[PDB]
Amino acid sequence: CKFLIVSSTAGNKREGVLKELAVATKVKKHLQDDMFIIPLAIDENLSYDDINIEIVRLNAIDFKKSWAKGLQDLLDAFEKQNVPPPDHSKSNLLYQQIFLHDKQAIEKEE
Amino acid sequence: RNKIFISHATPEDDDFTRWLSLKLIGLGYEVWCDILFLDKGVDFWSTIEKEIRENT
Amino acid sequence: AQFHDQLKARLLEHTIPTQILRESTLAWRDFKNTFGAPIRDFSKIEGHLAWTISTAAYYKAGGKPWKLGPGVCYLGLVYKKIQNACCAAQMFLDNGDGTVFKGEVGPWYNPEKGEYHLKPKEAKALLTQALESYKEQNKSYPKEVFIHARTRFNDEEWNAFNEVTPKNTNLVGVTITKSKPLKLYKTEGAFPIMRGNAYIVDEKKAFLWTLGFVPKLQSTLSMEVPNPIFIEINKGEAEIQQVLKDILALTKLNYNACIYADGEPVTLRFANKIGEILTASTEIKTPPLAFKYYI
Amino acid sequence: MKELIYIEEPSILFAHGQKCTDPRDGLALFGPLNQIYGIKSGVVGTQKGLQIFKSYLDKIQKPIYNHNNITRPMFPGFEAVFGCKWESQNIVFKEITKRTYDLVTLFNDKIITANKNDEERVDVWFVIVPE
DNA sequence: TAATAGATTAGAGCCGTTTA
Ligand SMILES: [Mg+2]
């Protein structure tokens, strides 16, 4: 439904993110909706200049200061764009599946 | 064509424009402000043109 | 030397949360050793620093950062040398599952210079204060009173405790000792023993590694080699596994910082802090008793 | 060869009823239990101390990264973690321009007069002590 | 009163910031 692209200094010129952004703009053109791709600018050193052409045309969300204000911008933009019962238990059970698999107490005699 | 457009300096003058827009919507008039109604992740200049010369 | 504690003691009369911040902490870059790196090298911990103080602020602004997961009143008491002054810190679970983590204050004065044991009258007063605090919070008397300290409980104070207590209330006394020289290493890996392991010595005594390697952090709560804390059930009847689990839970209440866990019970640490603050200045009737005025 | 039992690490609860192990990850994932609306910061100190606290608060609003992030998790930001405003532009400042006793009484009197006389409410006073 | 130990107890200080 939406494509948030991180717009840090490293994340705006790397090859993989560039190709993902390119196919994102292609599917945006296919979907004929301008409310698809959202840049999240987080990096103090990276100004609104020097940013990639493929995202320079679009309106970024200011995550440079107070990441939570950018989070609120993301939330009310999603509500304004009809982006489709919130349950934090899903994230609670998902946090240790991926982020804690090399970091756990596995049974082994020591 | 039924819309009101308010242009302003973005970094400095926001409180006045926000208050003016809020009062205008309270009065029933439809308004468009870049710090209130300009969507995120959208070509801002193209939408400003559309609002200015299409519905204003 | 006694600047912070006496500031807080003088501020105890009029209830105002306060946080003391040394200028060398907030901006450690500009203060230097005059011949190289700054005096307080906080580069590796700056974000962690920005964590801890934030929680401290959020703790002293009336916010509850986290709860714990009934009918058990933990009472950790610590002795202060001046005459001796015993000051305690209590916690339990409210009927709404809220973590009541107030104190047990109004320090009790044992006149002996080195007897870290409360007199029968002072022990009775401390215990009954804890029981009525529990009564007014949970509407009922506690089912079990897990009373712990860094000192062994002598016979006369134990008798005072069990005569001031009411019926159907089992209280067990626990002794926590730090710096006990049992340096258990790990033969295979280069990282010390993982945190949470317990070596049982007796049905009443054991060594618990409340600090050490944390699998979740891929590192250690303690530099060098961890020092297990000795947990002994000197008084009362309780299961040592249950006591170890409860004390591991109590090692999660460190609201004075934001750290995965601390090596000693937070009840004892906070009782020590409030006792030092109380002994810093003159006697004050009915101290505030909530830790936001001390930590 | 004595057997070492294991006590499962206790889980601390957070907002919405979710429990986590590390206070940092739990705070940055679900947030604190109760919500306060913000911190009315009070500063008691010299002008340089106020400037230092101002700068550090402004840095606190934005994320700060540890040198090693896997062991000690980073700070997403106070507004990101706790969800209550602690901006630096809402500070009640009190400037200061037996020796320990008098140094203590200076800040004590400042806090007493600012909490008694001043109309601005301070959730918690931060004694920014020089060095 | 002094001393010689062990067991506990308590303070204070002091540096590093948890091996990737
Ligand atoms: Mg503290």
Token readout for C141 is 């008397």
Q: Give C253 CA → E18 C1' in Å.
A: 20
- CA–CA separation, C242 vs C233, rounded Å? 11
Answer for C82: CB within 7 Å of strand E.
no
- CA–CA separation, D73 vs D28, rounded Å? 9
What length is written for chain C?
A: 295
Contact yes or no for A42/A64 (Cβ under 8 A): yes
Distance from CA of C3 to the nearest CA of D (A): 6
Residue ranges of alpha helices (H) inside chain D are: 23-29, 47-61, 78-81, 99-116
Q: Which residues of C are annotated as a binding site for Mg(2+)?
A: 256, 295
Please choose, from the candidates C112, C123, C119, C115, the residue with its C-alpha nearest in 3D space to the C-alpha of residue C77.
Answer: C123
Cβ contacts of A91 on chain D, cutoff 8 Å: 18, 29
> Quick check: C34 contacting A, CB < 8 Å?
no
CA quadruple C72, C78, C79, C85: dihedral sign: negative
Decide if C248 and D2 are in contact by the 8 Å CB cutoff.
no
The helix (run of H) or strand (run of E) holding residue C75 is strand C72-81
- The phi, psi pair for C215, rounded to 5°, reads -55, -35
Residue ranges of alpha helices (H) inside C139-178 are: 155-164
- CA–CA separation, C39 vs C52, rounded Å? 20
Single-letter code of the amino acid located at A108: K
Resolution of the determined structure in angstroms stands at 2.9
How many other C-beta atoms lie within 10 A of the C-beta of residue C35?
Answer: 5
What length is written for chain A?
A: 110
List the nucleotides on chain E closer than 7 A to a protein CB: 8-13, 16-20
- Pairing mode, if any, of strands C103-110 and C213-214? unpaired
Q: Give C82 CA → E7 C1' in Å.
A: 22
- CA–CA separation, C138 vs C75, rounded Å? 15
Answer for C31: CB within 7 Å of strand E.
no
CA C58, C64, C66 angle in degrees (round to 5)? 110
Total CB pairs under 8 A between chain A and C: 13
DSSP B25: H
- CA–CA separation, A58 vs A39, rounded Å? 7
Region class of C77: left (phi > 0), else alpha (psi between -120 and 50), else beta: beta
| C87 contact partners, CB below 8 Å, separation of at least 6 | C77, C78, C80, C103, C104, C105, C107, C108, C271, C272, C274, C275, C278
Cβ contacts of A34 on chain B, cutoff 8 Å: 42-43, 46-47
Please choose, from the candidates A96, C262, C45, the residue with its C-alpha nearest in 3D space to the C-alpha of residue D25.
Answer: A96
Single-letter code of the amino acid located at C230: F
Token readout for C24 is 């060398």
Q: Tell me, yes or no, whether chains B and A touch by having 3 or more C-beta pairs under 8 A.
A: yes
Which nucleotide C1' is nearest D70 CA? E20
Q: Tell me, yes or no, whether chains C and A touch by having 3 or more C-beta pairs under 8 A.
A: yes
Give the method used.
Answer: cryo-EM
> Quick check: D92 contacting C, CB < 8 Å?
no
